């Protein structure tokens, strides 16, 4: 009965991990709303020259960059290092991908990744940790395997200290394994490192990049897409707002990760009429502004009815009906959905699909009243009252 | 250990919901047999002019109409209203599908649907609610989201009153959302409606129908097929009975819903020899007659051994061996299976696949005895003793 | 440049084969229109007690039954005989019943036979998808009979003949099938003058209620009604109806590259200008008469005239077509060479394009544009 | 034997169509090279306020925008009008914006229109995949215009013309669209002398932020940037960069059998000997100049010369090719007739083969072999 | 009408290429039979210490090894060198061992080389699937050698030649591969008179036990034994055995459109009348002799005669064929142009059809019909 919730709360971060080069804030995965959704969320901040040390988790992550710009690099197993710099190579590594605010990034399960702030302002990103994803064969707990550094626990609720996976091996064995000296091997264990999982790169970081076979396809799996730019809108009403969808039809990698998302922008008083998601739980994170949100369950009860503003997280269970109205300054938010091609339906459109007399007898309405419901007013889900 | 059942009971409806235009009977989803199967069942009756108000659930439903005739209409999101009637349109809606006794209907997860009795006798349908379906991201509880009316709870065991999803919103907000007046909006909340989920349409219902791009495919997803007609038999022995299979190879939509079924008709003394389902749990609902049924588990124990008659439900767990023999008046039943292409095997056929000497040494049988088992008698699963 | 056609003709059968229990009429596969579409057509009539002897072809066939009722049986390789009557008096694969309005699908290489179970004759029109990707021989229609002594159904290809079994000696057939020379001789149909469709005196009798690998593949759905009023996917009570049959309704079609639609236009009903995005089409009028127009990429009406019952008209991929029912309406089936053929009607296109793009495109005023987009019924079926 | 070519030529447009708001230049589809690859190319220029009238073709088109910025709109059949401005002043399908460096994909049979939103003209090169499996007509390029009075863009195929709507009478158009004869007459573009690309005086205005089935299919991604420096999949700061665009980045390509790469070579940068395993390729130089060599199975350089901006060069499947940037570098797009074209460069091949196989193959000493395998950069982009 | 063949011939190689370490014999791709099937065949013999230099072709090849033992290595693009011997003395991709009875599959565009590891010569028959959908060039067989100075293996297509590397200058090769002119000169095989198969004096030595992307794609299964007695899918100890190799046993075949069967008939053993539903077939006799008969749709035996070791016989899709082992039996491989070719034998067909349909079809009595259906072994392999 994990989703038999009579109340839904707007949630904010519960735990904080302050590092040399940044901050990591996590929502406790044990909140009943998040347990129903089968996910948890993590907000990461990379300060100037901030470098998030390489790590991987046993489930996919969908991240939206809400501030700043940087680069992310993955370590795909067995793939060639297509970025090379001659000194005889002086260095070579895999493709460096750049991201900006409004972009969504996807981290594959088990694939190592690192990120770096390439701008002046701090990078702020919100990550949906899809812990319940079918690909996670461990358990519901969020887990982060660091390949470097001496991290602090990011999800403390699961401990009921941190260390890299390399610190679990002796320097002697690492020395032999990696055909290196024990001095190098000891450093690989981060024995005296006190910077934690996000460090500051003094002097700035330098990597091979134009801007700063298997290689053509798989090894270059597209893992980022802008979702917030106005021009990418899929639904639009100049006087109400816009809705943009990012799913497996845009980012094919999502098909195997069971995740998709939408970015919604509602202008002052703009309304996103009553709608529901047919095949997925959803998690709203407000990126800006404020608005009135209402979520109704199968008993016609509003499990949530209140203001929702920047920084808050609100779970909308599969099939529950939700509606939003932009406040004074409008409202913007991303909605993570636990399906690679999540589909929703809005009630206005439903009325149009049902025969006039079915509607009349259902709501005891007159022919003219029904007609006005099915044919009058703007057609889309975005309404300017 | 949800399926470690040492006993299986023939089950009948536990709860009843009497409405103006019909009746809804449900089997408690907490019976251990149903918990093992990961499903529950609901029997619906639409009286003359009976209209089942529009609703949707977060899992698929496979329904078999055992009596009467009517029409069902769905509300596919974003699809065009291909049925239109000029007065300038006087009304338009989506395709109306007709059904008759012996037909199976499939309801997609999250898709709204309504049904209406177009004949004189009442429509009686038995619905398999596939609550454990992978697409249900909530929890095991059955749930019905009504878009209209003031319903009573159909699965009371989950409350440990009813209302439409629209009654969860204020008339003022619905008024703005749907660009209508507050009078219409208040009626949309069904504030004074006491008819419940199945209403009687006085004077009969009228909808657009010849009989009473995306539109060509998806928006017209085939969601009904006759399963009981004699001529649709897949296995047949004039002196024993018949077996008909309905799976994803006949109704492609079933591939995504993980459901299939069979309709079996056994004549007097007709036998459906010992067989089992390799990849799916099964739920038998007797539509007519009576017969002796035996279910044996992995310890060689008959967890069920008795008469099974019209109206009773019997779960047959995956891999358990079952056999049926038509009684005096014969036996007819539908079997819902929780796989889009459920496959079964009958022991007679198994003997034929195993080498004679493997059989001899397995059962201490003589060469002649084995030969008679593998080659003598009718070949199929339907036996006339 | 097989489709660089400046003219399209309404075609009727050009060849006929008279047999004891029926008739087979075919359209010459060499007509420029049929060559562009990469198919040919065949009309088969089974008289009372008529039986079409077992045969198979290296490509799929989509058949619409326009009259009568009957049964069709296939021989799926290696599949068990699930129909049996108790030693076994007899056993055979599933028997499938059909009626007028039904569409049957014949898989490539799979033997099938048909029998008329009613009094009136069975009349069926078959689209022989010769250009199908599964046909690795050549674009010529071919029929491999397993029995009888047939006459060539498509003579244009030759530019006599027996069953495939007649190509073997009775001696070898006797050894192969572990049978005696007497039976083996008969398997070659040496003195059979009945041709491919025979009359079963006394009537045919088979195992059937009304008259593992099994559960699925071995008994896959190969027939579906397409003409019933209630099956309409598009409908305007004052104009007509359109029904679509594709891989979403009949899964096997996914592998055969074929789909169809059944159109019924009432008096003066119009199926407004539309085109198929991904497939060539072949119209066969089953009833009535109406005006049909087909326009190519140069804006030329390669066809502009009446089309009546029994006539065939090819509509090439992307060519724009429109139809209007005559005094007694018009009904027709449209075979399309794609498992999920998609069409688009111009009215709907106007709705998708911005007003000013339309205004500047056709030199129209905002008002007139508003007219095209929001006035009238929105569907493709129009009541003028 | 269309590809049994002993010679390959660098080709430039041979035909041109001047219209009011733009220009269309095409390469003759009959060049032996283009026939072997089964495609043709078209360069389209939209001048300021230029609008390319609605049209569709029976095959997919892959377009790279080499200059300017604009908007492209498609008309997906049966899809809802998700862009609306409040009765509705107007509503239409999604508007997609593009800039130089972007690749656009046009689905078969789907109408599309484009508009220049900037001051400089929009220049785009389109690969018309005429041999695509979805094209069931013939290998001839065809353009079905929904509006205007166009001139033939590919005249070689004829060996006048209007919109598909001009093929209908104004009377029938009036009845079909429930409109008056006046509007219907205009829908036929009878006195339009502007041709296929027109100039929108005052500028075009549409619904857009900057200027169910919806969520997915109805709004599928049909454009992606391929030329930005940051999108490089291969990179050597001293030699150049290679970017790949295929079905893994743009899903729709899976159904259209097309992919591409954008190559940028710096001064004297070399893209070492490589070949495409599963597709024919067509290079179009967007900037600079360089030496290109193409070798067939006989070890003959069917092409060995300079290739500069605006020139087209076909590289047949499996033929080995190499390029070297000139004094000012070389940039080019390569269209490939496969949704996921795979290539292989010889340097990498040496690494995969055992030393002694190599030694015995080329009569080299262990030392020299060691040279080929482990010395130098490992990638395909070489700085000599 | 390439398959409208009234006659089929048993074919033997017509051309030969003698090289230092082996021999290559080919069948002319222009034989009417081979053109109908859309393929050609090649027999390759590697003498002791023989090495077939690296090469690749724009279509898949299915090869059955009829004699000897050896190793085959491929060069998968961008894949890591997982075989290494410690700086690295050397590293290269996986080495795959094969023996007689094994079938090897060569992917389109992928370089491969083979080496004889035994004393007796390796003899292999290769089905060159030139008509494969992946081949976007033309139906001509082509071999792109990466090394050596080969002679044309399929001369009929020309109606000299070197390696693809010989098409480049040594200067450019030196720059491309970061090597010196000396090595580069050698990469062009200028004074090599050994041809495509060379003799490795002293024997070849490679990394191998016996002599991420890795785990999967980069090391996909490309070989499987098909001839071992124990692998039989069909078996009658008194008649023979049939083994099938398709995409269900070797996944890669799904992408190459090929499958095969290995048939062994004992003395007088019969493979009763059967046909392939979805593919053309090419028989190659590996041992013995027997009577083969092929009947077309007119009931004419387009082939009726003996077929012995080393002979090739095409059996077109849907044509009915039967074989009977001679005094010393008959063994043969059958290549089929479909990843999952399906066949059907007439005996099984009789079992699927109702008694009365059969009675009326062949004018047989209930008794005789009962004979065909239930008497004798039920399988396709018959002991007369
Ligand atoms: Mg929302
Ligand atoms: Mg049962
Ligand atoms: Mg039509
Ligand atoms: Mg290139
Ligand atoms: Mg054979």
Curated annotation (Swiss-Prot), chains C, D, E:
Emulsification efficiency of glycinin is improved by degree-dependent glycation with soy soluble polysaccharide (SSPS) at 60 degrees Celsius in both the acidic (A) and basic (B) polypeptides as a result of subunit dissociation at the quaternary level. Thermal treatment of soybean seed proteins leads to the aggregation of glycinin acidic and basic polypeptides (GAP and GBP, respectively). GBP improve sensory properties of meat (e.g. pork) during chilled storage and inhibit bacterial growth (e.g. L.monocytogenes, B.subtilis, E.coli and S.enteritidis). Disulfide bonds join 3-36, 79-218. Glycans are attached at residue 49. Residues 183-196 have a biased composition (Basic and acidic residues). During soybean germination, seed storage proteins are hydrolyzed by protease/26S proteasome. The keyword Glycoprotein applies. Coiled coil: none annotated. It comes from the Eukaryota. Residues 8-185, 224-370 form the Cupin type-1 domain. Pfam families: Cupin_1. GO terms for molecular function: nutrient reservoir activity. Glycinin is the major seed storage protein of soybean. Glycinin basic peptides (GBPs), and, to a lower extent, glycinin exhibit antibacterial activity against Gram-negative and Gram-positive bacteria (e.g. L.monocytogenes, B.subtilis, E.coli and S.enteritidis) by forming pores and aggregating in transmembranes, leading to membrane permeability and, eventually, cell death. This is Glycinin G5. It comes from Glycine max. The gene is GY5.
């Amino acid at each position: 009965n994990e989703c038999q919730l009579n109340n839904l709360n707007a949630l904010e971060p519960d735990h904080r991990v302050e590092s040399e080069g940044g901050l990591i804030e996590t929502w406790n995965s044990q909140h009943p709303e998040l347990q129903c959704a089968g996910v948890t969320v993590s907000k990461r901040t990379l300060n100037r020259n901030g470098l998030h040390l390489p790590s991987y988790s046993p489930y996919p992550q969908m991240i939206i960059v809400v501030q700043g710009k940087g680069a992310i690099g993955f370590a795909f197993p067995g793939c060639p290092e297509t970025f090379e710099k001659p000194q005889q190579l002086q260095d070579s590594h895999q493709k460096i991908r750049h991201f900006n605010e409004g972009d969504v990034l996807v981290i594959p399960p088990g694939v190592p990744y690192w990120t770096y702030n390439t701008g002046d302002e701090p990078v702020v990103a919100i990550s949906l940790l899809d812990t319940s994803n079918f690909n996670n064969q461990l358990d519901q707990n969020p887990r982060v395997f660091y390949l470097a550094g001496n991290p602090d626990i990011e999800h403390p609720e699961t401990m009921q200290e941190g260390g890299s996976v390399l610190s679990g091996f002796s320097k002697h064995f690492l020395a032999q394994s990696f055909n290196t000296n024990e001095d190098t091997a000891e450093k690989l264990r981060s024995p005296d490192d006190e910077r934690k999982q996000i460090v500051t790169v003094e002097g700035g970081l330098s990597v091979i990049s134009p801007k700063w076979g298997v290689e053509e396809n798989i090894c270059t799996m597209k893992l980022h897409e802008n979702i917030a730019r106005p021009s990418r809108a899929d639904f639009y009403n100049p006087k109400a707002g816009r809705i943009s969808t990012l799913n497996s039809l845009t980012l094919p990698a999502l098909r195997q990760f069971g995740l998709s998302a939408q970015y919604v922008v509602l202008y002052r008083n703009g309304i996103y009429s009553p709608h529901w998601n047919l095949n997925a739980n959803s998690v709203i994170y407000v990126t800006r502004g404020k608005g009135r949100v209402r979520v109704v369950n199968c008993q016609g009860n509003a499990v949530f009815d209140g203001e929702l503003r920047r920084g808050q997280l609100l779970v909308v269970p599969q099939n529950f009906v939700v509606a939003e109205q932009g406040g004074e300054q409008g409202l913007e938010y991303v909605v993570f959905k636990t399906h690679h091609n999540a589909v929703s339906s809005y009630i206005k459109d439903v009325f149009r699909a049902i025969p006039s007399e079915v509607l009349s007898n259902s709501y005891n309405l007159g022919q003219s009243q029904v007609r006005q419901l099915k044919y009058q007013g703007n057609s889309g889900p975005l309404v300017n009252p």
